[PDB]
Design a protein around this ligand. Structure first.
Ligand SMILES: [Cl-]
Lengths: 296, 247
């Protein structure tokens, strides 16, 4: 455990120290987990997260560098990133993010996301808060605390109600067979939010949220979404709203942008575009990798 | 595991990566100490049939026992265990497997109790840390049960087949795990063997692709067939009450 120069960074299972290597004096992120406070010892969630990250080695996924056991502690050594997307979006809100940077970020997120789905891993809770960026113009998927890997959940929603602004509508409708498409939806809402500086589905809670989506994308039916009316939480008494002129929703978007967003936002999980598929979308025809100046 | 959740976007190569991962885990678990001696031992029979009944009684996820067995083996082959702590190790392997695959958590206090004697949760938990240190805190494995589905994918089988097939293979695999002469065999070989026993001359995609599959995995027709006989031996000699009769 010594090759470090700790510094604070309210973390996850306790604190989260930013630190330096001793040999390499390199910035790293340390997640501290206690092994001697819980009835069953090492939390099953930590165990699942570790095995999950062990297989997720990709440039666009925060990398688990090492797992160190010391005393009554378990230290997860993650690669260190300076900040998250929420802070960034807020440090240029009026200024907006340049298209080349928005395109690059969405491009990387779809790469990390494609890698994830190729390993039977669903993130289930993608949002600005857990999409970290560094000073080399990279953005990475982080915090797989609500992930479903190999079909097994690291944690279920029932207790961890985060934010529902990026939750796919099939989850909201209690679909019992939801899968990888739910993450694509989250990215679709995040891709828009970047462009407009505003959250796509600014819903109040649980109930509103679903309607917030209906009042924007129109109440789905059996034509656009075969099987909706059979969803566990679908209600025949639902209000029949209609689509909104998307051209007015995400205005600064070019014919390709909405072309990609419209496919990441299909009500039908079967029609919704995949990560792999979106990678070959023309909107990514001219993708560079600009590197922003970070407000640190 | 509700089947093979989140697997639609997989392409042959991904399934191969997974197989390669169980190959490596098999190796890491095999470059042990006195490998054959552990698998032929009588104490391994008691330990696996015990964990097995415990899993059936507590009505555990069907992937808990399989992993618990893969983990018990690496622990026995990667460290020196005193006979007094055998039963305890079997409980830890069980406890750790639950933390990975179980829906209903598997409690240490309950396991200590099932162990009886001077065994306590506090002792099992101290043993779990030492065990996880051995496993470098990476506790999940790619089991033969898990492989069954990566193989059906590679053979572009229809969705509807998986279920019936998984359910026929599961029981054979569990028996194979309790037999040292069949449990020391590579994971895919056990998987393919059980799949042969259930799919051979019954499904056309099986019969059309099994040769290439075996070839790409370096498995000869001879190896597959021998394994099939090891598994059938494992099935015939399986006794749920072994740990009772002998222990
Ligand atoms: Cl409404």
């Amino acid at each position: 455990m010594e090759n470090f120069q700790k510094v604070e960074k309210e973390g996850t299972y306790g604190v989260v120290y930013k630190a330096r290597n001793k040999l390499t004096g390199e910035v790293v992120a340390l997640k501290k987990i206690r092994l001697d406070t819980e009835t069953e010892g090492v939390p099953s969630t930590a165990i699942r997260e570790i095995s999950l990250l062990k297989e997720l080695n990709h440039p666009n996924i925060v990398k688990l560098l090492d797992v160190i056991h010391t005393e009554n502690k378990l230290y997860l050594v993650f690669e260190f990133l300076h900040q998250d997307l929420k802070k960034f979006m807020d440090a240029s809100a009026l200024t907006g993010i340049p298209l080349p940077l928005i395109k690059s970020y969405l491009f990387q997120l779809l790469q990390g996301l494609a890698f994830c789905h190729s390993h039977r891993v669903l993130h289930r809770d993608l949002k600005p808060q857990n999409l970290l960026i560094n000073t080399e113009g990279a953005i990475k998927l982080a915090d797989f605390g609500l992930a479903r890997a190999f079909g097994v959940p690291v944690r279920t929603y029932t207790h961890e109600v985060v934010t529902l602004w990026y939750r796919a509508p099939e989850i909201l409708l209690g679909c019992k067979y939801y899968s990888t498409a739910v993450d694509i939806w989250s990215l679709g809402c995040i891709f828009a939010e970047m462009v407009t500086r505003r959250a796509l589905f600014p819903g109040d809670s649980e109930i509103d949220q679903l309607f917030r989506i209906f009042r924007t994308l129109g109440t789905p039916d059996e034509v656009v979404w075969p099987g909706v009316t059979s969803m566990p939480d679908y209600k025949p008494s639902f209000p029949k709203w209609a689509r909104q002129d998307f051209s007015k929703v995400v205005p600064p978007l070019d014919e390709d942008g909405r072309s990609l967003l419209s496919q990441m936002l299909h009500y039908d999980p079967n029609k919704r575009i995949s990560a792999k598929a979106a990678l070959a979308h023309p909107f990514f025809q001219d993708v560079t990798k600009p590197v922003p100046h970070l407000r640190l | 595991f509700q089947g093979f959740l989140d697997s639609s976007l997989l392409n042959e190569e991904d399934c191969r990566q997974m197989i390669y991962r169980s190959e490596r885990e098999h190796d890491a678990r095999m470059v042990g100490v006195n490998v054959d001696q552990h698998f032929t031992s009588q104490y391994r029979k008691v330990l696996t049939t015990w964990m097995f009944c415990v899993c059936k009684d507590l009505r555990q996820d069907n992937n808990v026992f399989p992993l618990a067995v893969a983990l018990l083996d690496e622990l026995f082959l990667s460290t020196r265990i005193d006979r007094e702590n055998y039963q305890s190790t079997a409980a830890v392997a069980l406890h750790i497997a639950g933390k990975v695959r179980a829906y209903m958590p598997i409690k240490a206090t309950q396991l200590a109790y099932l162990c009886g004697g001077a065994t306590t949760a506090d002792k099992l938990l101290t043993l779990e840390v030492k065990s996880l240190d051995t496993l470098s805190w990476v506790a999940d494995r790619c089991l033969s049960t898990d492989l069954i589905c990566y193989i059906l994918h590679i053979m572009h089988a229809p969705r509807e087949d998986y279920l019936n097939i998984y359910n026929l293979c599961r029981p054979k695999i569990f028996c194979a795990l309790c037999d040292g002469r069949s449990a020391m065999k590579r994971p895919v070989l056990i998987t393919l063997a059980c799949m042969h026993l259930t799919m051979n001359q019954k499904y056309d995609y099986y019969e059309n692709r099994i040769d290439g599959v075996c070839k790409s995995l370096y498995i000869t027709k001879e190896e597959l067939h021998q394994c099939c006989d090891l598994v059938d031996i494992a099935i015939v000699s399986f006794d749920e009450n072994y740990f009772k009769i002998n222990a």
